[PDB]
Symmetry: D2
Subunit: 330 residues, 4 copies
């Protein structure tokens, strides 16, 4: 296969993580980006990163192109999909990382201008088909617009895949302890709701997520069986899924941990891993696994009532899945 | 009743919170403290607090006495209970806030020197009787040495009391998102185990707690039915209990929230309250309630599988219970 | 005097601090506010504050009015000064706390609609007269539009007043270690320049300030003699001025500290104080002094080369000066 | 030259940074360490680092040896220099990183047991000769016990070298904005003085440093001409020197920046660099330069009164100098 050619719409945390990941691999090539910023600021943000460290390599411009380690990348700056002829620079797949385009209606214009496939970097706001690697990726039907779901779906999903396949999930509730993100306020200031208005680096902030209820999209046998919620805490990156569930049969802790290690070695290779070293959140910064189960934190009480704790780099793991998904569907 | 006279052994976060709470009430009087610090540093730490703000009032010394708003308080500085004649300064109850004395054997010397009652500010390391206000305080038998359990027991306990009395708990697992505390490291440095060695203000740190399994001490019907664990996050104070449980019957969200509001108004007055305002952690700094249930975060799936989220000021709520317990047993 | 009636345009950190300060005093009355938020969010942000704690008292609405402890306050929600008939609700002075209106041209519409006086909550972007209490407030000429300068001017200004009056300033450079503020990013994301794009709670961020060069506006004898700069650090509130200067004559540390204590007791009463207790930043949260000189940090080398360190609550001290200035010019 | 063989006494932040730096170079070899920890915790802390990331490579034990990428390193665990036969494992130089041994008297026992040279990882508490690379390293006389001074000396020193050589320093005062370190408290708790007792991740904390006054040890022409102080802020690593000085003649900003760039390219190659990219603190995590002058922050007022801002990774820059110094004196 020729390396699939892709464009990135939206050069934020996910956009720039995706770009770095594409530049480390030989089976995918970045030809264009779009962000509503001047080129001096694009270069600076790409080169220097508080979380993932300095990009090793030259980051130059000339004058509508990023030049990264000598390779030219076209840079657009328009809010309007009309002005983004990504296909004209060779793009086969657009990675949609703006947060602005989460319906087929708003992504169809890319296809109409000659892009073959669009992948949303977030849950769809309509009935756009949703795919998650290792969970329902085997069912892909060649659709030209898909959702890759959320960072949380790409941790919780693989965990559920293993539990459902080995044991059976009767019901479950999930909390995520989640790193703060953009569109949380630095100081108490107006936002879309009360709790999101409060200072993110000095509070525990309850925040809603549809990630659990929406598992029906990628595992329909879990329709009506899972819900959950989030607690935003003062870390800049890395999060955990805390899944509490009732399984269809009696299990032990060891049996659960062994099922995860067996998937880590086979069907979820590269996607789920198991931590036997007692790491903390910062150890998973720039980790490409979507789920890291902390084996020592696995609990079972009264035969069938379990807790599983899985880390995810909400930036780097999800970005790693977006890039895997572009390579998979090409 | 004459105001019960008490001494505080250990003038740390709990010791100093307890002292401030005693100085705001007329039914308890502080006569002595002990801490292995010089008197200049005792005054400074008591007067200024990063979390709970400046003490309003005069904080002076003369020269073995704190003088707080004109009232003289004896200050000892010895690690050894032998040198602490608290009873000689009128103390009826010792609040044991050192972390050093969590067995009847190590507290008996206080009784032997004329103290009437000792209350441990932590779970006992032996079979010392444990009491929690609103949970099993009605069963107190006049024992002269007791444990008031942990900050977590004084949030989770009252929550369980309500769930058990209205609905029946079949089984449950708990996560606490907990503020960092003393004897967590500022930077990666050796501690009693791996995870406790890691920088507390820049990581999510899984940490063990016996608080759930130990609920059998205060609610024996929950023997073998609860376990749980902790995630230390970068907040200086205030924590949450996240309880996931299977109840003995079908319930709704509204029914659970109404049971909490009914206890808040009756048997758990002053102990449990319900938040209907969508507060965040910093809103509960210096809150005297041991449990604040966030009503909007209450979840039920598949009839009987529930999640309840309750805040607690791990410093001020527990300290408020220690002071209530001293007044109650006097 | 009747209590001067004021309106607040812009209900952010400064707007809400100003409002709380007005509600604690009997010589000024708040009749109206404006902020582009729904009334539910206005109430929540006013009631709960991560930094300054819960407002003690009832915060209700009915339905275009905040009702605070029973007193009705009109709430507008328009970006356009055209729609803000503050004078119709009795306002004599508008406190301009939006950041949007820092020229006489943009504030004249308030006067044209019957407001007597406007005070900008920031340095003017034109030649609008600037006044700072204790510095050049004695020179006020009855102007109907003024600037109260910046939080930094209201710390550095009073410090310079004392140094200039006792000793003579030949030249000086200033660094401020400054709390993060709104319009700093939570995560690395595009902003008006490179450094402002970087995560505020995980970096030391050099940031420009005109506060030193602009001292000529309030002390013309310092024209061309001072410049300085800022380092934003991860604290939510409270900052320091670090002034390094060459004085016109030889001085000692004691002589400098005594000059500050003498101004604290006389001409800068309520404005500058001296800390002899070795406090840290969080001790000055909700402090109404514009400058708190840390006496133990005062340095002199080689006769005439000095350093002075002064704290300021960048929110509460400046807000306290805005309210003092409204009362002073009424 | 054979690669000089060294041992590390004290495996904390400096000890472990030094070890990682030694394992990346071919001109120095690590044969032994000492730390009062069990071997499981030594491995974990070496392998995982909140600040500098995961060690790339195998970290094993057998059973009194770290095995790092296949190479055996002896591990002692004794507080007493008596039990540390580093020379028996081939060590020529001991890097003294405990903080416990800062006099010739306390380091002489190493020489007496066959070590050729000891380097203190901190300023000496006696008249032990002090050397700093690029500053007075050319004057080394073969002394077998030296101090490498402090992290701050290894930033401020090189900056002064350039200013003194090009312009002449008449006098100067310095502030450092410094990352928190071990032996600062996580929560308000007793420490050696008042300010060090206060919570390090939620305050700006004034802290004393002898680094400026002590410049006379490495540049005697600066005897009595410099003093300074520190402000600890909530960052886990990386600090800045803010030097304010009066030079012997008139200079411009450009002239100062050009003098630094010229030293960066010649006599201070590898030691001082100049930032022309507007980086923030986290960009210098794991930076080996002892001084990074931020060229855009250089200020001059009234001919001869200057400010210079220089970053340093207080861990990695100093550690890089310790390793350079061991190679230089071998
Ligand atoms: N943990 C995570 O961060 C994470 C993980 C997985 C999924 N996601 C999802 O990924 C998406 C991006 O999140 P993020 O964290 O990368 O946010 P971000 O850092 O704010 O990135 C979004 C970027 O898109 C730009 N943008 C917005 N609308 C645009 C438009 N119409 N045309 C062009 N550029 C536009 C933004 O500029 P402006 O700021 O000026 O609007 C910004 O640079 C969202 O859908 C988010 O939910 C986030
Ligand atoms: N969230 C909370 O903080 C919280 C809540 C509920 C329960 N607790 C429990 O309350 C107790 C105290 O916790 P804390 O957070 O207040 O800790 P802390 O701030 O470290 O306070 C403990 C204090 O006791 C002193 N001390 C220790 N051993 C002593 C002895 N033998 N004699 C005299 N003084 C002694 C310590 O001095 P040294 O530092 O020199 O040893 C320190 O000042 C522990 O049992 C803890 O588990 C904590
Ligand atoms: N340390 C400090 O915070 C400090 C100290 C002294 C001086 N100041 C100055 O005080 C002013 C406010 O600062 P702040 O920290 O309070 O910022 P803030 O919290 O962002 O407050 C500004 C508020 O004004 C609103 N607003 C903006 N433009 C408006 C308009 N045209 N009409 C109505 N409302 C409008 C904003 O809504 P939107 O967010 O939607 O625009 C926001 O609620 C600035 O001039 C600032 O430089 C700040
Ligand atoms: N920014 C920086 O961190 C920095 C920069 C330059 C210079 N330094 C200097 O470098 C030295 C170490 O600082 P650090 O930050 O690495 O501190 P650290 O992380 O606390 O490391 C010190 C280590 O030495 C151990 N230790 C102490 N006394 C010992 C003894 N007698 N024998 C054996 N091991 C002993 C400690 O164990 P215990 O904790 O049990 O005592 C700890 O592991 C100090 O002199 C410091 O001032 C620090
Ligand atoms: Na590539
Ligand atoms: Na927020
Ligand atoms: Na009392
Ligand atoms: Na820790
Ligand atoms: Na009033
Ligand atoms: Na910023
Ligand atoms: Na080596
Ligand atoms: Na400290």
């Amino acid at each position: 296969a020729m390396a699939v050619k892709v464009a990135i719409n939206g050069f934020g945390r996910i956009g720039r993580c995706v770009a770095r990941i594409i530049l480390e691999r030989n089976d995918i090539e970045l030809v264009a980006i779009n962000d509503t910023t001047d080129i001096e600021l694009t270069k600076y943000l790409f080169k220097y990163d508080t979380v993932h460290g300095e990009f090793k390599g030259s980051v130059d411009s000339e004058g509508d192109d990023l030049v990264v380690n000598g390779k030219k990348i076209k840079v657009f700056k328009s809010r309007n999909v009309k002005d983004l002829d990504f296909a004209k620079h060779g793009a086969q797949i657009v990675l949609e990382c703006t947060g602005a385009h989460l319906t087929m209606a708003k992504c169809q214009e890319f296809i109409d201008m000659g892009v073959q496939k669009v992948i949303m970097s977030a849950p769809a706001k309509d009935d756009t088909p949703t795919y998650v690697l290792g969970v329902n990726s085997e069912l892909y039907k060649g659709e030209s617009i898909i959702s890759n779901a959320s960072c949380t779906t790409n941790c919780l999903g693989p965990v559920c895949r293993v539990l459902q396949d080995n044991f059976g999930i009767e019901k479950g509730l999930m909390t995520t302890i989640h790193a703060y993100t953009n569109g949380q306020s630095i100081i108490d200031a107006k936002a879309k709701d009360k709790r999101r208005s409060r200072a993110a680096a000095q509070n525990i902030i309850p925040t809603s997520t549809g990630a659990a209820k929406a598992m029906k999209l990628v595992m329909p046998e879990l329709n009506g069986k899972l819900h959950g919620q989030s607690m935003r805490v003062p870390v800049i990156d890395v999060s955990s899924v805390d899944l509490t569930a009732q399984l269809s049969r009696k299990v032990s802790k060891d049996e659960i941990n062994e099922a995860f290690r067996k998937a880590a070695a086979t069907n979820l290779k590269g996607i789920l891993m198991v931590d036997d070293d007692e790491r903390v959140s910062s150890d998973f910064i720039t980790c490409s696994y979507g789920a890291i189960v902390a084996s020592d934190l696995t609990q079972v009480i009264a035969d069938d009532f379990i807790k599983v704790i899985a880390w995810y780099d909400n930036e780097w793991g999800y970005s790693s899945r977006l890039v895997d998904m572009a390579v998979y569907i090409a």
